[PDB]
Each structure stands twice: as C-alpha cells, then as structure tokens.
C-alpha cells in the first residue's frame, strides 16, 4: 500500500559503513554524498510514486495471452517507458553501449528500491540486465554491437531459456537442439518452461538466451551450448525484420508475481547464434551466477522492507509482542541490506579491480546471500502480515501479495536447497579453503581491531561466539565430507543459515563501529546512530544465537534412512 | 491432490501411547481397537474420497455473492449432505439433542482427517459445532430445544459474530447495539466482519451468535452480551418464519480457504435473544476457548499432514537435502498429532471424568497447542511446497493452496501472539503455578521411570536438557513478570515455542517408549515401530535443540 524508499539508511551504508567515496575501486570516487543522495532520491521517487501504486494492480490483473501476444497489467507499459526514459535500466553497464558505468553496488541499491516497490514489474528490466550481461561477457564484438545498445536501454528486453518439462534439476537431459546452418547461425528447436518475461508487448524485440545441444557433442551437460535467439531477426541497419520461430504458447497461473509473464516457449527452427564457446553453455551460465544470486537475494530483502513499512504503519494506528515482531524484521532488514551491498561492493572490486581475492570471497558468499536473504526475507513478510491480524488475510490489504511474491525468490535461480549443497559441496573446497580461511581472518581481524574500543566489546563478543560456531561447523564438513558425505550434505541448509547469521553479525559489528564513531565526532543525526546501536544489540542477543541451533542440527550426523 | 487418512498412526496413538484401555474416563472402555479402527476407516474414506477432490474446487471457485445470497463451490453441498447423513457432525455431542456422545478425543481424531482433506469445507460443520456448544453450555432449555437438534445434525448451521471494522484487537470499542424490545427479545444493529460461513445455501437456516452492547449497560467489554440471531425466525411449530434483518453485504476476497465464505454481516433491527447473562458475553466465550484453540491447532497440523503426503509423493517420483526437509515435516507432524490427541484426551478427563488435574493441565497447554501447531504447521507446508521446485509455485500443483489455507489458523480464533501473552500473563499464574509444576513433575516423572540407562537414554537425556531450558524460562517470568512486565512479555512468543518443543519431546519420549515396548512384545508392524524410533531420534537431535534459541531470546529480557 505505501513504499517509502529507505534512502537515509542506504546513504548511511554507502558512506559511514562501506565508505564508497574513498574506495580505491575504479568508479567509486564519483560516489560523493551529494551525488549518491541525488541518484537515490530520484530512484526512490520513481519507486514510491510510479512503481508501487502498480504493485496491487499487477497482482489483480496478471498477464493475458492472446494469439502469441501477452498483455501485461494496465499501466506497466507506461511505467516501463518512464523507467527506460530515465536511464535507469543501465546505471551500471559500460558506456560503450549506452550505460552509465556506475558501480554495481549502486545499481543494486537502486534495484532494491524498484524491486521492493513492485517486484513483478522490476523483473522485466532485471531479467534483461542479466541477459545483456551474459552477452557482454561472452559475446563477439558483432553480437555486442547488435544486441547490447537496445538491451541496455530496454528498447529490447531479454531472458534466459534453460529448463524443459522432462528435465527437472538436470539440464543435461534437455532435448532442445541447435542444428548448424551454412550461414554461421543455428536453428533451435525445443520447448522451454518457466520463462520469465518470455513474451510481452512492452518492447519491440525480445532477446532470448537458449540452452540447446548441437548434435554430435558430448553427452549430458558437457554438450549444452548457449544461443542468442531474437524474437524479431535484426537487419543490417538494426531495424527489425522477420518474426523468428519462437512463441509463447502458454502463460502459467502462479502463486504470485502475476504482473510478470511466465511462459512455455516453443522454438521451431528459430534462427540463433552461438553465444560463448561451443558445448560450453553451462560454463557461460557459471560466470553469471554471482550476480544472478545477488539479484535474487535483493528481491527477498526488498519484499521484507516493503512489508515491514506497511506493518509498522498499521501498528502505529507499544505492545510488547508487536514490538518484538517489528524489531526482528527491522534488525534483519538492515543487517541484510548491509550484507547485500557489501557483496555488491566486492563484485565491483573483483570485476573492476581484477581482484582475485574479492572474486573468491564473493563467490563463497553469494549462495549465502541468495538462500539466507530469501528465506529470512520471506519469513519476515509473513511476520509483517501477522501484524495486521485478520485484516492481513484479506487481499485488498496488500500484505498477502508481499509474502506470495517473496515466495518465488526461494525457488527460482537455483532453489535454496541447491544453493546450500553448492555452498558445502563446491564452495568450501575451492583453492584448499583459502577463501573460507580469508572470511574467518576477516571476522577475526574486525574483532581484534574494533575491540580496541571498549564500547565495541558488547558487539565483538557475540560475534566471536557466533564465529566459533561457523568454525565448528566447517570442521564437521572437513571430516565427514569424504567419510560420510550424506551426513555432510544433510547439514548443508543449516550451514547456509549459520553462515548467514555470522554475515549479518559482522555487518552489525561494522554498523555499530561506524555509528559509535559518528556519535563521537558529532556527525549525522544522533538519534539515527543511537537507533543503530540498539538495533545491533537486538540482533546480537536475539537473532545471532540461532547459530547454536544450526550447529546442533549440523553435528547431528546423517539422518535415518527409512 | 491426494489425501490418505493416517488411520494407522491415529490407531497407534489411541491404544499404544494414550492407552485408552487403561483410561477410566466415562466412555473410554468402549474405545476398543476394533471399534476405533472401524470409525477411523469410515471417516478416512469420506475424507480421502469425498472431501479432498473438492479441496482444489473450493480454491478455484470460491464463493459468489448476489444481493445477500451466496453460492458455495460446486460439489460442497452434496458433500455436506453426505457428511450430515452419516451422523458425522454430532459424533461427540450429547445424545439428548441428537448426538452420539463419543469421546472428544475421537471427534478430534476424526476432525483432523476431514480438515486435512478439505479445510474450507470442514469449517462449515466446525463453526456450527462451536456455535452449538455455546448454546448447549449457556442456553435455556427452550433455547436448547429450539436450536440444538437442527444444529447438531447441521440442518441448521451456526457461526460467531464478534469483531467490527474499528475494533479488533479491541472488542470493547464495540458499536453493535442490542435494544431491549417489548416482547422480551432485542433489536440487534451493527456491522460485523470476518464472519466465517456468514451466508451460504448449504443449510435451511443459519444461527448467528452475536456480541453486542445493551444500551444503558456498562461502558466497554463489560457492557457486551451474547445473542442468538437466526437468519430466519423460528416459529412455534418449529419451522421457518420471517426473514430476519441479517445480511451478508460483502464476501471477502481472502488469501485462502476461498471455499469458506467470509462475510461482512449487517444487522438492521435484527431480532435476537440473549444467550447467557446480560453483559457477560465475553465471559461466556471463556468457557469455549480450550476446544476452540484445540480445533484450530488441529487445522494447522492437518494442513502440514496433507502437504507432506503430496511432497512425499513428489519426492518418490535419496537426496540429502530433501531427506532432511521431509524428516523435519514428519517428526513435527507425528509429534504434534500425539500432542493434539493427548490434549483432547485431557478435555475428556476434565469434562467427563471431572479430573480437575486434567482441566488445569489442558487449560495451561491449549494456547501452546493453538500457537505452536499452527506456526510450525504453516512452516512445514511451505517446506512441502519447496520440495516441488518451480512446479510448487504453479497453482495447478496444489501446494500453494496448502500454505495459503494454513495461514489463517495462525491468525483467527486469537492470533498466536495473543495466545502467547495469555500463556505467560494469565496461565502461568493459575493457582500459584500448580499446573506448571505438575507439567514439570510429569516430565521429571517420565524421565525417571523410562530411565537413563536403557535404550531410552537416547530420548530422556535430550528431553531433560530441554526441560531445564523451560524451567530457566519459567524462572525468568516468575521472577521478572511484575518487576519489568514489558521485559517478560516480549519473550512470551519464544516461551510458547519453547513450551511447544518440550511438549513434542515428551510425546516423542512417550512414543519411543511405547514403540520399544511394542517391538519387544511382538505387537504390530515392526517396521512401523522402528520408523517411530528413528523419527523420535530425529526430533530430539534436530528440532528439540530449538529450546536453546528460545531461552536466549527470553533471557535477553526487555527490548528498546
């Protein structure tokens, strides 16, 4: 019902905590407070005044499919023009193809605001950004000159076409095919399901990235390639030619995000072009996973944020059960926003700084960003709906939509359980655990440096205790990883949440230390900083102790088989 | 999309765990194994074969309103006739007005199956059961003789009319008026919201129970009385006369249970009759709370049961994450069921055996049954949905409905936060904590008798650790509750989940013991009891440790 962009909290994170204007990463020196302030207030105006009033409209209307045309909710198109016309869909993309090359950290902060105001709307440009990013990374110079300029501005949109009805979690079973043609292109045939924004009338062209097998390649995943398959073939001048052999043949009726079409896509000898290396389609997907995971983590946080604002309004129209509920929401949201943006900052250092240590740490942490933020974020939307009592169960109240939309973020882009197995079964073993050790040194380093201020001990000591639990958990996996992997993998989900709590506890440590220092120097509003110290204390004593529960569930071994 | 009554699990609970054969409560000697098995199979067949296929129909059709007349989902009315005809809506009600006077324990066991098969459908008879109980307990003989026989058989239905647009949480700011009339009735005027089964055509008449203030009476809740307001006035001859001034002016569009109509009820000089005493309406409902709470906790368990069955089906069409997920669901559901049925048994001993120790214990535990089983129950249905992957988010798969329907049980009939505050701010203080102590005595006693040497050490030692956490939690309240009351009551919600876990651990302790016993006695299916043992170990090591997190969140005391 209302969305007020948390620009004050974001501005505090960027400058008091992440210290962006003095970060030596390329592009960060431009992020002066007046600049970031201006950008955030403009994006938050579009969020609160344009996107959010359409949120309930998209839930009420959904999408309609009429002879291969999909009409999104009334108003979505006009808001899509406004967002595009403002340059918002390529804040963080290279200037060569029309982007503004701002740091990904800032694209992510703006994206939280858009996604919270209206998740289903924001996925149209969110999915395009992901598809465009894959073409930037893997495209030939010709492919980037053909597709990126229109995709950066969302004149053209795009999306991924990965899985098939018979596949399941194993895309190495896919039956879609790509037959080489004498003109360099391929002809793609097959059927893809669960395609977000697979079809809609808000853009002149839709650029699909499709996984398919070139006949003759290795069996399973080792034979899958990636293809650019435009809805309308592009002519030499860049104008649109013939309708390509790709159509939405059905839209799904889903639990939520009704404003975002989900289709079955049919490919009937569609013209496409190899993206990346032949038979290395999944390699190409691997390189995109860090940002895709942060993007979905952001969605879950954003749902918690909007639901919490509206629960806090209802409460104000204090009760000790209500106060405890709202403080659980608020301490999670602000800790998770710090975790998200710190993650985004590290992507910038890995990508723009060519820093391999930042790249290793962020790749360890993104499954945690995705799984933890979407699970906790969903739980908070449920708790926010609970604040409304019986009114919370009525759809016109708006709260049910927040949970239902949040629900998909736990599922798509790698189901939370898959993120957990990847964390334990792939990420902990990278480079002899170097980046696991680095995260521990990070936590130990912060505890020892910040501990020189006695006022910080109230925060360093709960974090130290929580960090020993993560340390005790990483051990269980060092042993039983190979002597009883079933026991190791059974604890994966708990390990992901144990790690998640330590990450939020570290961020609360950092925010405590920054707000102490702003109080000691008289900077900023003194009530804001006192409120951060109280909210930090709440997280350390009320939420962080969950690490003991996750540890107990881990150190219990393999489950009974039955 | 499928529902198979868990009659085997229910049967084991009645005879091996709750030991109904040793129970001297009136009626319990009649609960022989062959008797209960026959009852449960018949109810199971109705549940899986009749109500469940209509569950999705209820979700996709909902209810339609056209100037006061409400069309329910296609097929609901025929299912309702079949259930009525079989005597299922007065199983545990008194024979004097048409019931069968079976134990509340068996009606609750039957009720979980109906509710799991189709929650929105089962609420039509369930709300009538609740409305008929309030008339049985507080009604004149004329009122019982006029309304109960038709309500017991569900030829007439019933429902409660309490909160108003500007009230809840505060029912004292109630604006509904009941003006005394010359002829001894009252004229009811006002507006009521969230009225489940407010209007529909599955019954010839609907008996509304309405809270309203008699003018000139006390100022707030103390001025609130309870009234019988029938949709159609009943004439002397016992048939329907005039249409009363009672109208469903709007059907709510809700998150789930679409099949259960929810109305805004408008009262315009509706003819009503005082139920109970003037200005003692809220007090009248205090007496219904133990069974209302248990019935809604039953709804939460029953949603987790049907969701788990279908997630199980889907997982069978090894994976270590999936195995853990399914075992969290299974260990909650089976422990929750034992907790629920143990509560229904104690209602029987209180109500039928006049066991005051069972009354005290069950009155302590019912807010835990309602709040804990509906919270955990909802979480399990979300995890069941998670097993389906992308397909779980497609409405046709059926898993979405299970969570959306479960969501209401945490809200209505007293939101779970109200249940938690009542547990800590009112139940812990009953009779100087006598029942609290008896619960600890019950856990200590079980631990000593089951021993800490044999094959039970597995289960008694974690139960002892969890019990100590509950004692440290109770020490915090008994010692801070009136020093800094905001501090204590902030941790009320954590105390309710802490208590819930200990109750489930005790039930798994009792189940592990009865299954060790049965294995040694060559009784029943051995694989059943070996699975019981492994599920108990799981609960003790994977779910019971949550008491430590709840204790920490209590001992941190007051919040900013």
Short mmCIF file of C-alpha atoms in Angstrom, two decimals, chain A residues 164-165 168 193-194 252-258 262 314 318-321 323-324 327-328 375 378-379 381-396 400 403-408 410-411 415-418 420-421 485-487 489-494 534-535 538 541-549 552-554 556-562, chain B residues 164-165 168-169 193-194 250 252-257 262 316 318-321 323-325 327-328 375 378-379 381-383 385-387 389-396 400 403-408 410-411 415-418 420-421 485-487 489-491 493-494 527 530-531 534-535 537-538 541-546 548-549 552-554 556-560:
data_model
loop_
_atom_site.label_atom_id
_atom_site.label_comp_id
_atom_site.label_asym_id
_atom_site.label_seq_id
_atom_site.Cartn_x
_atom_site.Cartn_y
_atom_site.Cartn_z
CA UNK A 164 12.40 -28.26 -20.11
CA UNK A 165 9.33 -30.15 -18.84
CA UNK A 168 13.99 -31.33 -13.74
CA UNK A 193 9.21 -23.80 -19.45
CA UNK A 194 9.13 -21.25 -16.62
CA UNK A 252 1.38 -20.04 -16.15
CA UNK A 253 -1.08 -19.25 -13.38
CA UNK A 254 1.30 -18.82 -10.44
CA UNK A 255 1.11 -18.16 -6.70
CA UNK A 256 2.38 -14.60 -7.16
CA UNK A 257 4.27 -12.09 -9.31
CA UNK A 258 1.24 -12.19 -11.61
CA UNK A 262 5.81 -16.85 -17.24
CA UNK A 314 -0.63 -0.48 10.86
CA UNK A 318 3.99 -0.02 22.39
CA UNK A 319 2.60 -3.56 22.56
CA UNK A 320 5.40 -5.95 23.66
CA UNK A 321 4.60 -8.78 21.25
CA UNK A 323 7.50 -4.52 19.29
CA UNK A 324 9.40 -7.83 19.34
CA UNK A 327 12.41 -5.47 15.83
CA UNK A 328 13.03 -8.97 14.39
CA UNK A 375 14.36 -17.45 3.45
CA UNK A 378 10.02 -14.42 3.25
CA UNK A 379 9.65 -15.22 6.98
CA UNK A 381 6.92 -10.82 5.16
CA UNK A 382 4.84 -13.48 6.91
CA UNK A 383 5.55 -11.79 10.27
CA UNK A 384 4.64 -8.39 8.80
CA UNK A 385 1.33 -9.83 7.55
CA UNK A 386 0.77 -11.18 11.08
CA UNK A 387 0.92 -7.61 12.48
CA UNK A 388 -2.33 -6.88 10.57
CA UNK A 389 -4.31 -9.62 12.31
CA UNK A 390 -7.45 -10.69 10.47
CA UNK A 391 -7.01 -7.80 8.04
CA UNK A 392 -3.72 -9.43 6.98
CA UNK A 393 -5.61 -12.31 5.36
CA UNK A 394 -7.70 -10.01 3.12
CA UNK A 395 -6.17 -9.41 -0.30
CA UNK A 396 -7.13 -5.72 -0.59
CA UNK A 400 -0.62 -11.41 1.26
CA UNK A 403 4.61 -12.99 1.00
CA UNK A 404 3.41 -14.61 -2.23
CA UNK A 405 5.80 -12.57 -4.40
CA UNK A 406 8.66 -13.15 -1.94
CA UNK A 407 7.99 -16.89 -2.14
CA UNK A 408 9.40 -17.30 -5.67
CA UNK A 410 13.42 -19.06 -2.52
CA UNK A 411 12.73 -21.22 -5.56
CA UNK A 415 16.42 -23.41 -5.32
CA UNK A 416 17.58 -22.61 -1.82
CA UNK A 417 18.43 -26.23 -1.19
CA UNK A 418 20.62 -26.23 -4.31
CA UNK A 420 23.09 -24.90 0.25
CA UNK A 421 24.52 -28.01 -1.46
CA UNK A 485 29.11 -37.31 2.60
CA UNK A 486 25.41 -37.99 3.26
CA UNK A 487 25.94 -36.62 6.79
CA UNK A 489 25.21 -32.77 2.80
CA UNK A 490 22.28 -33.24 5.21
CA UNK A 491 23.64 -30.31 7.28
CA UNK A 492 24.14 -28.04 4.24
CA UNK A 493 20.97 -25.96 4.68
CA UNK A 494 21.75 -25.26 8.34
CA UNK A 534 20.16 -0.53 19.84
CA UNK A 535 19.17 -2.48 16.71
CA UNK A 538 18.95 -6.66 19.38
CA UNK A 541 21.27 -11.14 21.53
CA UNK A 542 18.02 -12.21 19.79
CA UNK A 543 18.87 -13.41 16.26
CA UNK A 544 22.58 -14.33 16.20
CA UNK A 545 22.12 -17.08 18.87
CA UNK A 546 20.39 -19.10 16.11
CA UNK A 547 23.90 -20.22 15.10
CA UNK A 548 23.79 -22.63 18.08
CA UNK A 549 20.66 -24.28 16.68
CA UNK A 552 23.39 -28.68 16.69
CA UNK A 553 21.48 -29.68 13.56
CA UNK A 554 24.80 -30.00 11.67
CA UNK A 556 23.84 -34.44 14.47
CA UNK A 557 25.06 -36.70 11.72
CA UNK A 558 23.37 -38.30 8.75
CA UNK A 559 19.63 -38.66 9.14
CA UNK A 560 17.91 -42.06 9.45
CA UNK A 561 17.39 -43.54 6.01
CA UNK A 562 13.90 -45.19 6.35
CA UNK B 164 -16.09 -4.98 13.90
CA UNK B 165 -14.32 -2.68 11.39
CA UNK B 168 -10.11 -5.82 16.83
CA UNK B 169 -7.82 -6.04 18.65
CA UNK B 193 -16.53 -8.51 9.79
CA UNK B 194 -14.61 -11.72 9.10
CA UNK B 250 -19.91 -8.35 1.08
CA UNK B 252 -14.19 -11.04 1.47
CA UNK B 253 -11.54 -11.92 -1.10
CA UNK B 254 -9.01 -13.71 1.10
CA UNK B 255 -5.60 -15.35 0.74
CA UNK B 256 -7.04 -18.87 1.05
CA UNK B 257 -9.97 -21.00 2.25
CA UNK B 262 -16.35 -14.88 4.79
CA UNK B 316 9.34 -40.51 -4.71
CA UNK B 318 17.72 -40.21 -1.52
CA UNK B 319 18.81 -36.61 -1.97
CA UNK B 320 20.25 -35.45 1.38
CA UNK B 321 18.60 -32.02 1.49
CA UNK B 323 15.53 -36.18 3.16
CA UNK B 324 16.18 -33.63 5.90
CA UNK B 325 13.25 -31.46 4.75
CA UNK B 327 12.11 -35.60 8.15
CA UNK B 328 11.54 -32.16 9.67
CA UNK B 375 3.12 -21.79 13.35
CA UNK B 378 2.43 -23.43 8.30
CA UNK B 379 6.24 -23.64 8.07
CA UNK B 381 3.52 -26.64 4.36
CA UNK B 382 5.98 -24.07 2.96
CA UNK B 383 8.76 -26.69 3.10
CA UNK B 385 5.85 -26.76 -1.32
CA UNK B 386 9.63 -26.25 -1.57
CA UNK B 387 10.02 -29.96 -2.49
CA UNK B 389 10.66 -26.77 -7.00
CA UNK B 390 9.42 -24.49 -9.75
CA UNK B 391 6.27 -26.61 -10.04
CA UNK B 392 5.48 -25.68 -6.42
CA UNK B 393 4.76 -22.08 -7.47
CA UNK B 394 2.26 -23.14 -10.17
CA UNK B 395 -1.26 -23.06 -8.73
CA UNK B 396 -2.35 -26.23 -10.56
CA UNK B 400 0.28 -23.23 -2.85
CA UNK B 403 0.11 -22.93 2.65
CA UNK B 404 -2.49 -20.23 1.98
CA UNK B 405 -5.19 -22.21 3.77
CA UNK B 406 -2.86 -22.94 6.70
CA UNK B 407 -2.03 -19.25 7.02
CA UNK B 408 -5.36 -18.30 8.62
CA UNK B 410 -2.22 -18.55 12.96
CA UNK B 411 -4.49 -15.53 12.83
CA UNK B 415 -3.79 -14.58 16.85
CA UNK B 416 -0.81 -16.58 18.02
CA UNK B 417 0.71 -13.54 19.75
CA UNK B 418 -2.44 -13.24 21.84
CA UNK B 420 1.48 -16.36 23.78
CA UNK B 421 0.64 -13.39 26.01
CA UNK B 485 6.41 -6.53 32.69
CA UNK B 486 7.34 -5.31 29.20
CA UNK B 487 10.55 -7.34 29.55
CA UNK B 489 6.02 -10.28 27.91
CA UNK B 490 8.40 -9.52 25.00
CA UNK B 491 9.64 -13.12 25.38
CA UNK B 493 6.17 -15.74 21.97
CA UNK B 494 9.50 -17.51 22.47
CA UNK B 527 8.88 -51.52 10.65
CA UNK B 530 11.38 -48.94 14.04
CA UNK B 531 10.44 -45.87 11.98
CA UNK B 534 14.21 -43.17 14.14
CA UNK B 535 11.76 -40.27 13.84
CA UNK B 537 15.78 -39.61 17.49
CA UNK B 538 15.48 -37.03 14.73
CA UNK B 541 18.57 -34.05 17.93
CA UNK B 542 17.34 -31.77 15.10
CA UNK B 543 14.24 -29.95 16.38
CA UNK B 544 14.26 -30.08 20.19
CA UNK B 545 17.58 -28.04 20.40
CA UNK B 546 15.50 -25.03 19.32
CA UNK B 548 18.14 -23.12 23.44
CA UNK B 549 17.42 -20.35 20.94
CA UNK B 552 18.36 -16.96 24.79
CA UNK B 553 15.66 -14.71 23.32
CA UNK B 554 13.77 -14.78 26.64
CA UNK B 556 17.84 -11.07 26.90
CA UNK B 557 14.78 -9.51 28.66
CA UNK B 558 13.34 -6.17 27.54
CA UNK B 559 13.66 -4.65 24.01
CA UNK B 560 14.29 -0.97 23.22
#
